[PDB]
Amino acid sequence: ERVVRDSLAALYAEEDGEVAKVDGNRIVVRYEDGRLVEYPLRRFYRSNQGTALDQRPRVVVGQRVRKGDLLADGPASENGFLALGQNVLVAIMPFDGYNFEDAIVISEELLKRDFYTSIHIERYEIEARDTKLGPERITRDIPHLSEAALRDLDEEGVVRIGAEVKPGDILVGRTSFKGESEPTPEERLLRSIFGEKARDVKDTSLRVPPGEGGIVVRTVRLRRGDPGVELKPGVREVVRVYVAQKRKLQVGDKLANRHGNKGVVAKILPVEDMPHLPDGTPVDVILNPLGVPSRMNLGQILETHLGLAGYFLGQRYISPIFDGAKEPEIKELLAQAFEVYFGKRKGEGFGVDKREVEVLRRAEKLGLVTPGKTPEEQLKELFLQGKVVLYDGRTGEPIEGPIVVGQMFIMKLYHMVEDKMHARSTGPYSLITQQPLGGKAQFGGQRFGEMEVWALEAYGAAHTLQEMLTLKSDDIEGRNAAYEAIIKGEDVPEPSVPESFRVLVKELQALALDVQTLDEKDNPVDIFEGLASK
Amino acid sequence: ALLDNGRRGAPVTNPGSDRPLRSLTDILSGKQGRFRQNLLGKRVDYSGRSVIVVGPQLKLHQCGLPKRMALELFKPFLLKKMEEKGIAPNVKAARRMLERQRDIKDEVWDALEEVIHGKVVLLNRAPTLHRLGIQAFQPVLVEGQSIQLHPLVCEAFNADFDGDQMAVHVPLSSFAQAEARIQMLSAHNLLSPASGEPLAKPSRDIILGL
Amino acid sequence: AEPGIDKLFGMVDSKYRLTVVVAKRAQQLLRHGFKNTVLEPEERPKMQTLEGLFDDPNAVTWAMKELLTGRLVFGENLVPEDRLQKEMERLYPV
């Protein structure tokens, strides 16, 4: 509560009073003073990390509120309490190796009821500026484009609010005056064949990058010569387009609890495959027990037990640091919960199951329950240990032993596959080195570093290594010929001298050092190919 | 200063800055120097990266490879195949078709299945401490944005699924492909080059069950 | 694991020589369009499409299987390069 309160994200009432108005956009409060105060609410605003900060009203019109009482909930908060995630029904058990090495299995039911769904907004920007070749213009008129491509653009060339954009789609249309050049003879012949003059302007439109896209929620345009706005020198106009997306939990997303247990979602099973309680209730998350003993975080286990107790008693708990609920009390709560979990069934006119009997047999074989007691008493003894009978949804047969099941608090972290997935065939290269750029944002290639080279050397893979050092990097003729060969179905040609070596040679020349490539006869070999000597 | 700045006396800096100017010597030497940055290693084409996920159903020589990632990595091959099949008049049209994500039909995925047939890709995880830091796998196209890794190789990579990421590389030539399939294949490297003991072996849950 | 990899390693004193033989043979097959194969119509590697069984596009698989048959001869200085290339272009044009 205190964290949310000091956070300032959430909204509270200044003094005692009565609520005059409640809206999605605003809340109006009439205090004791008689003064009418209106509090506007922040709706779907984009944070620095692209998470959506938004406030929702928790009060109704005419409600009597006191001083410091909650009016609106901020982001990641529930009724004034910190909500960093969701409360899920978790079972601790291995599952077909899908739980292997901290991996996590989740139920599709989570997606069905929109658990772990998050709103994210990305900001796109493009400038139209004055050039010595003429002004850049933001327009719907873009050369060589079909009406299909310009569909969602307004008169001015900006995408319409509410439109769905996918990778490749135009957000803001822009044309730039083509730099002067002489058309190749091929272009002359082509131009003559089609009888169509080459257009003056080129398509510089801002487009959606790979892996992104969503719904356009906002558009902002700032021109030159309009009241209240002034851009940097040379810049005519700036347009911003805000695109938001609803992200459902998926395979590769990262989950974690407050005890340091973290793992990525590797498998989402249909509800029928999920392990389930005898009364038909399926679990949400399956966590591997192998993660506990080596990590020595037992807090998640107790949270699971107390979470079970709270799940059946329909209540929540506050366990303070170092002075909290201890084992006996949790056992008591587990008994009170067992009364509801079992007594209900017995009242419904149902007795113990055969498979429950078998599981109980194996359980007393494990020394978990005391031999000679009734099945109900033994089930209670197991329930006090935080373990329950669990049925395999595939077979219908139970798990051969009692398994820990309960409510756990699990958070969805900022690391999501959608953001991190990236791939590149060919693309932008660096100025000096002529090697591919870095980072997803520049559409860059991966860095093959010293140690990777060491690996390739250790494999004795010489042609692969040579590919890495030449055709896939700074060998220009090599990469061109390679691409052409691959698209022509031909095998790739012999690679040439990497450009960074030529750069090295010239930089060594700048330091007054003469580097000469020699043949077996010690005669000079020109790696500059007729270009660098008079 | 031009040859080696900072070498003798206070380094000359640009006005309104404490940052020493970068001389030829600085360009040549160091972690960011020409040798270590651009010569003994390079950034490369036909490469990718993603989060890893356990793949119990996979065979030892297989890995899960996202369809979109494969579409990008094998893009030229896919263009050629789209030219062979009637999907596109020529390579240029195929590329123009791949540019927009909504223009992608279902036959090109089949074409992509045809392209990667028998070929393998390389998986890498940092830090790459030994030669098994890079391994070869026969890719099996899967829906989703995650790369699927076989459990048994997790030890050699020191890989786990708490959010670890891996890089993918495509060997282009017949020679490179041969090297990858024969020398670099995961199933062909089962023993440690250090101790001679088995590296790819049952662990964790497997051991538990057995 | 690649089929008969142990036996393939058996045929050579060095794994890298196996790799070179396979790669070069694959280059031959690609260059001459598979019509120089030592395989029999029933030994031909197959690939399942939507249509049905078709010829395997992968030349490395072909080369490895061919090598496994034993009908291929590999070594050093078996024949001058030009003579080999020209006789191959005579037997199997392009």
């Binding site: - | - | 020589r17 070179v20 790669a23 030592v38 001869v73 590999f74 200085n77 006789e87 037997l91």
Partner: peptide, 30 residues
């Protein structure tokens, strides 16, 4: 100068028996 790049295995030639025999006849008749 290692692996497939080592001078030891690098120059290794491959030839099918049909073409090999053809070449042999070509060299015999000269």
């Amino acid at each position: 100068p290692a692996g497939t790049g080592s001078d030891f295995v690098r120059f290794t030639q491959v030839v099918d028996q049909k073409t090999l025999k053809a070449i042999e006849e070509a060299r015999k008749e000269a």
